[PDB]
Amino acid sequence: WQSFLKKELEFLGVTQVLVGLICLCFGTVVCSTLQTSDFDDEVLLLYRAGYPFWGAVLFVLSGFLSIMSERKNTLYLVRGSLGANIVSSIAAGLGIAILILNLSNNSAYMNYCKDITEDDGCFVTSFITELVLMLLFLTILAFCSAVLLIIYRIGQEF
Amino acid sequence: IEYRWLQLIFPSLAVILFAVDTGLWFSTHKQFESILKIQ
Amino acid sequence: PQLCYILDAILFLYGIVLTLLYCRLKIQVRKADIASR
Amino acid sequence: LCYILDAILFLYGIVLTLLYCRLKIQVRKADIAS
Ligand SMILES: CC(C)CCC[C@@H](C)[C@H]1CC[C@H]2[C@@H]3CC=C4C[C@@H](OC(=O)CCC(=O)O)CC[C@]4(C)[C@H]3CC[C@]12C
């Protein structure tokens, strides 16, 4: 399974670059379009903790270093891409915890919502719930990819 | 409400990625055009 | 309503799957064409 | 509009799925013959 993971190692970094750039896009549309003082910090815990920005930077960095360490096979890119994947797995686990916490906060908010279009806060909470759900899916992909990169570059060193 | 366009964020981010895919089609077709021309 | 948003979200997930598969195929064809060259 | 904008965009996604399934069989056909 060493070659069976090395053949898809570059894709397994490209998915981190993709998840990071979608994290940047979601963070910049939440930062620009939303007036975040009109909504609760429990509902916007994804943006209040800043996870799209510091998760986007770390996912793009670790995926880019994974792409470069596949494409160059340099002994300095490896152990730099491995450390980038350690901190990307830490960022993805913290993001998974933050997104589950924000899902719980959004469920507690939408308990007090008769419909998705009850007011502006219910709709923005449901939109954030949808965006938390498809950042939880992408963070699960990025976490599984980063853990697989960790397994490959640790079993390589065994 | 005046926040409906946030749910226009999702398909627009789709029509970016699908657009990326047709680039990722063409850039995969031409490098598969240049790999069957050599045989 | 909720149905159009659910269908929109599953279409975005479909877009994620297709761009992951096109990225996989792109690096595969790039590897096969940088191996021959 | 979201229903027409997603009905045309599912079609634009089925088209890309068809071209992926058309490219993948050609890649594996070239991979069979080295
Ligand atoms: C707002 C979000 C939805 C947009 C961000 C998605 C795309 C702009 C990026 C994310 C990661 C990128 C991928 C990162 C790495 C690669 C490897 C790259 O390799 C090459 O450069 C080939 C070189 C050559 O053809 O000579 C080909 C493009 C690709 C698949 C990229 C395709 C475009 C992707 C999907």
Curated annotation (Swiss-Prot), chain A:
**The entry's keywords:** Disulfide bond, IgE-binding protein, Membrane, Phosphoprotein, Receptor, Transmembrane, Transmembrane helix
Q: What does this protein do?
A: High affinity receptor that binds to the Fc region of immunoglobulins epsilon. Aggregation of FCER1 by multivalent antigens is required for the full mast cell response, including the release of preformed mediators (such as histamine) by degranulation and de novo production of lipid mediators and cytokines. Also mediates the secretion of important lymphokines. Binding of allergen to receptor-bound IgE leads to cell activation and the release of mediators responsible for the manifestations of allergy.
Protein name per Swiss-Prot or TrEMBL: High affinity immunoglobulin epsilon receptor subunit beta
Q: From the UniProt record, which GO molecular function terms apply? A: IgE binding; phosphoprotein binding; protein kinase binding; SH2 domain binding
GO BP, sorted A to Z = cell surface receptor signaling pathway; immune response; positive regulation of mast cell degranulation; regulation of release of sequestered calcium ion into cytosol; signal transduction
List the Cytoplasmic topological domains: 69-81
Main localization category: membrane
Topological domain (Extracellular) residues are 31-48, 102-130
Q: How does it sit in the membrane?
A: Multi-pass membrane protein
Its quaternary organisation is: Tetramer of an alpha chain, a beta chain, and two disulfide linked gamma chains. Binds LILRB1. Interacts with FES/FPS and LYN. Interacts with FGR.
Curated annotation (Swiss-Prot), chain B:
Compartment(s): Cell membrane
Explain the purpose of this protein.
High-affinity receptor for immunoglobulin epsilon/IgE. Mediates IgE effector functions in myeloid cells. Upon IgE binding and antigen/allergen cross-linking initiates signaling pathways that lead to myeloid cell activation and differentiation. On mast cells, basophils and eosinophils stimulates the secretion of vasoactive amines, lipid mediators and cytokines that contribute to inflammatory response, tissue remodeling and cytotoxicity against microbes.
Assembly and interaction partners: Tetramer of an alpha chain, a beta chain, and two disulfide linked gamma chains. Interacts with IGHE (via CH3 region).
Please tell me the species this chain comes from: Rattus norvegicus
What are the TM regions of this chain, as residue ranges? 8-26
Name what induces it. Exhibits night/day variations with a 15-fold increased expression at night in the pineal gland. Up-regulation is due to a large degree to the release of norepinephrine from nerve terminals in the pineal gland and cAMP signaling pathway (at protein level).
Q: What is this protein called?
A: High affinity immunoglobulin epsilon receptor subunit alpha
The tissues in which it is expressed are: Expressed in leukocytes and pinealocytes at night (at protein level).
UniProtKB/Swiss-Prot annotation, chain C:
Q: Which GO terms describe its molecular function?
A: identical protein binding; IgE binding; IgE receptor activity; IgG binding; protein heterodimerization activity; protein homodimerization activity
Q: In which tissues is it expressed?
A: Expressed in leukocytes and pinealocytes. Expression in the pineal gland does not undergo circadian variations.
Question: What are the recorded Gene Ontology BP terms?
Answer: antigen processing and presentation of exogenous peptide antigen via MHC class I; antigen processing and presentation of exogenous peptide antigen via MHC class II; cell surface receptor signaling pathway; cellular response to low-density lipoprotein particle stimulus; defense response to bacterium; Fc receptor mediated stimulatory signaling pathway; Fc-epsilon receptor signaling pathway; Fc-gamma receptor signaling pathway
Q: Which residues cross the membrane?
A: 3-23
Which key words are in the record? Answer: Cell membrane, Disulfide bond, IgE-binding protein, Immunity, Innate immunity, Membrane, Phosphoprotein, Receptor, Signal, Transmembrane, Transmembrane helix
The organism sits in which domain of life?
Answer: Eukaryota
Q: Where in the cell is it found?
A: Cell membrane
Q: Name one GO cellular component term.
A: Fc-gamma receptor III complex
Q: So what family is this one in?
A: Belongs to the CD3Z/FCER1G family.
Name the chain's protein.
Answer: High affinity immunoglobulin epsilon receptor subunit gamma
Q: Which organism is it from?
A: Rattus norvegicus (Rat)
Q: Which gene encodes it?
A: Fcer1g
From Swiss-Prot, chain D:
Q: Where are the transmembrane segments?
A: 1-21
**Tissues in which the UniProt entry reports expression:** Expressed in leukocytes and pinealocytes. Expression in the pineal gland does not undergo circadian variations.
Q: Where in the cell is it found?
A: Cell membrane
Superkingdom of origin organism: Eukaryota
Q: Which family does it belong to?
A: Belongs to the CD3Z/FCER1G family.
Q: What does this protein do?
A: Adapter protein containing an immunoreceptor tyrosine-based activation motif (ITAM) that transduces activation signals from various immunoreceptors. As a component of the high-affinity immunoglobulin E (IgE) receptor, mediates allergic inflammatory signaling in mast cells. As a constitutive component of interleukin-3 receptor complex, selectively mediates interleukin 4/IL4 production by basophils priming T-cells toward effector T-helper 2 subset. Associates with pattern recognition receptors CLEC4D and CLEC4E to form a functional signaling complex in myeloid cells.
Name under which the protein is recorded:
High affinity immunoglobulin epsilon receptor subunit gamma
Q: Please state which portion of the whole protein this structure contains, as first and last residue out of the total length.
A: 24 to 57 of 86
